[PDB]
Amino acid sequence: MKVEIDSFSGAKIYPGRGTLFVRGDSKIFRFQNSKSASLFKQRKNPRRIAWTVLFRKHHKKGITEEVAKKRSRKTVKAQRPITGASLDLIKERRSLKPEVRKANREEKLKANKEKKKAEKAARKAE
Template identity: 50%
Template sequence: MVLKTELCRFSGAKIYPGKGIRFVRGDSQVFLFASSKCKRYFHNRLKPAKLTWTAVYRKQHKKDIHDETATVLPPYTRKLTEVDRWCTLKSSGKEDQRSLRFGMQPEKQPCGSSLSQLQAF
């Protein structure tokens, strides 16, 4: 079942059926208020834009930024770099346990330090 909610004419709050205060002005204009506080401020002619708890103030001062879809960040993408893992493991003194466990032998390529030694000859 869908409930028809209305908005308070002063604060901008949602008003569910059976709640709120309805005021009809002399020119037959209908105002619906969420609470007696909203009704009192309306009749005292206070501006909702000057009260920090109203929706008008929050919209003017950009307080509800998380509701706007314009400021969505782009998805995080990872930059891939190519690394010779066997060379780095060999130079650090560790063996690739996973490849040895499954019987796979990685291609043995000379590391950067041994490559410079080979080029020296």
């Protein structure tokens, strides 16, 4: 079975009971009883009418659907391998990252020597 929602009051619509209405511009309206349909034809505002769910929703009358909201305290913070770098090699690189000051200094010295050699070669060419 399919259970519907009243347009005027949001009341629960069960198979068999209720009435369906269509306007000139092909709009679906469902009314649970004769009262809601009568008010709809009387052009009474469902929001203004007290016993509909819309008025309660606006005025926060008995609004206790959720006692407290749920929010993410932190991110997933999951670890997964990236491309062909491999998780084991990534972990090895992370472990070897500290105590790299000597390697950085050696690389800087090699780069300085290469720059000096390039400058000498350029001077010789000129």
